[PDB]
RNA sequence: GGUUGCUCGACUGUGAGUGGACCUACCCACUGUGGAAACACCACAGGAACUUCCAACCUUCGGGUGGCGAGGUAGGGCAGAAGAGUGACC
């Protein structure tokens, strides 16, 4: 018997400067008791409009909520890159209160080809009989690429990990890190190690690469 | 201007277990404010939790932990609580306190959270990580960093030469090895001059396990 | 015996549209606002509207003033009054 606060779009690209509209939708009439967050990756909320359409003191004039029966909007006139965050509606019409399931918001930039890297493995790690190798991937965008290990020029399957960071606030860019890992015997069975690279910045495929063993 | 909350009392429980959640107050009395508690399982969103309205001390709660969870107060000592009993997997998550605002500044919206402490619901035992160095090759700037591998719970922090350097540097999000252990790198990216005369330090404190490392990385030996 | 007053008075009424606004105290509610206040507590304002009434007050007798939570309890108020007395008159 709860209010549903249904959000969405689920997220959103856009350019710098656009108009963006976040739509939260109450399953029942909530009055106005409508309050929108902001949350950059990694800190608390911060509170964005209270009582739909009231701006909070100190947000920027950008934001705006709204409402419209049962129907609640928040908008950004025009993007900032520090707009780079997950935006939650919530009603406290009445217990349980309930959040929307949020929308996140990403900046929109020119493209840039990753910085390339390939890091072989620790002389302390390989004494541990583990060996992992990371290719590294610096301050691009858009953020879609393909990796690809080939050891010996076979291409490798399920063996690699990657993780990217959360778009720059301020480059808007993107860094990935991905990881093959390998048992001691599996890497000393071989010498060339690569890290194969597609992405929208590069007009051809870039390879670092290093043989086992060279000083 | 010190409105702050303070949350503490979170950590690796195992299923089934009790935690207390405290929320410490500054700068305001929460006598005359309702505090509530918002949790947020990894990247997931936000899920209210409980509540405790003041001047009459009712407490609300989220349908999810109804007769786990009791939300309380202490007057006295400007603190709030969570008692939380009967942990399951998905009670995993940050436990984030918030004040409501004062309704004639700010609605019922919750004007301050604090920084959320984290809950992990799991009965994997505790293991620290062991950071192996990350370093420049031949290649006007180049890269190194460090790898913090196989630790468990969340979170490690790595900071390089103490804080000293903070820019060019990308501390990647842990995944979640096979294992069932943390894994993860950080790679900040520097000038080829300064490789021959800037010693680089990462300095990694893994708090769940009593953990603290500082690993030098340096060049290739040969 | 009437007839009527006069006085006392058990008891009963305070009737809702073709027709109910008497007062006070407590309790009990209901709505809105505000109190650092979503509930609880406190304060304060209200109980549709059109009517109806004057148990109340003022009157130059023209009128005017003021007044509604159909809650419960308790006093009262105003009406009746069974009865008594108690006269006058026939």
């Known amino acids: 018997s709860d209010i549903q606060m249904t959000q969405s779009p689920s997220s959103l690209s856009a350019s710098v400067g656009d108009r963006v509209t976040i739509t939260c939708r109450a399953s029942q009439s909530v009055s106005s008791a409508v309050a929108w967050y902001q949350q950059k990756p990694g800190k608390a909320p911060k509170l964005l409009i209270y009582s739909a359409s009231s701006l909070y003191s100190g947000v920027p004039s950008r934001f705006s909520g709204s409402r419209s029966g049962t129907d609640f909007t928040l908008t950004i006139s025009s993007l900032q890159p520090e707009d780079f965050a997950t935006y939650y509606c919530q009603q406290s019409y009445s217990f349980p209160s309930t959040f929307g399931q949020g929308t996140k918001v990403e900046i929109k930039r020119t493209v840039a080809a990753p910085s390339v890297f390939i890091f072989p493995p620790s002389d302390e790690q390989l004494k541990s009989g583990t060996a992992s190798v990371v290719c590294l991937l610096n301050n691009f965008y858009p953020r879609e690429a393909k990796v690809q290990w080939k050891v010996d020029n076979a291409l490798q399957s399920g063996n690699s990990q990657e993780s990217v960071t959360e778009q720059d606030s301020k480059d808007s860019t993107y860094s990935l890190s991905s990881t093959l890992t390998l048992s001691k015997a599996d890497y000393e069975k071989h010498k060339v190690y690569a890290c194969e690279v597609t992405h929208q910045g590069l007009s051809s495929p870039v390879t670092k690469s290093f043989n086992r063993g060279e000083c | 201007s010190e409105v702050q909350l303070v949350e503490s009392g979170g950590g690796l429980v195992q299923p089934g277990g009790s935690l207390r959640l405290s929320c410490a107050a500054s700068?305001?009395?929460?006598?005359?404010?309702?505090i509530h508690w918002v949790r947020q399982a990894p990247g997931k969103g936000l899920e209210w939790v409980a509540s405790i309205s003041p001047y009459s001390g009712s407490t609300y709660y989220a349908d999810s932990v109804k007769g786990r969870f009791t939300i309380s107060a202490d007057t006295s000592k400007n603190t709030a609580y969570l008692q939380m009993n009967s942990l399951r997997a998905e009670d995993t998550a940050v436990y984030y306190c918030?004040?409501?605002?004062?309704?004639?500044?700010?609605?019922?919206?919750?004007?301050?959270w604090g920084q959320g402490t984290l809950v992990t619901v799991s009965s994997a035992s505790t293991k620290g990580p062991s950071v192996f160095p990350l370093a420049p090759s031949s290649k006007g700037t180049a890269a190194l960093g460090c790898l913090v591998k196989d630790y468990f719970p969340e979170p490690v922090t790595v900071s390089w030469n103490s804080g000293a350097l903070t820019s060019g540097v990308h501390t990647f999000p842990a995944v979640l090895q096979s294992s069932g252990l943390y894994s993860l790198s950080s790679v900040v990216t520097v000038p080829s001059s300064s490789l021959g005369t800037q010693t680089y330090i990462c300095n990694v404190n893994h708090k769940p396990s009593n953990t603290k490392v500082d690993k030098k990385v340096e060049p290739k030996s040969c």
């Open positions: 918030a004040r409501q605002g004062y309704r004639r500044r700010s609605g019922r919206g919750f004007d301050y």
């Open positions: 700068g305001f009395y929460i006598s005359y404010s309702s």
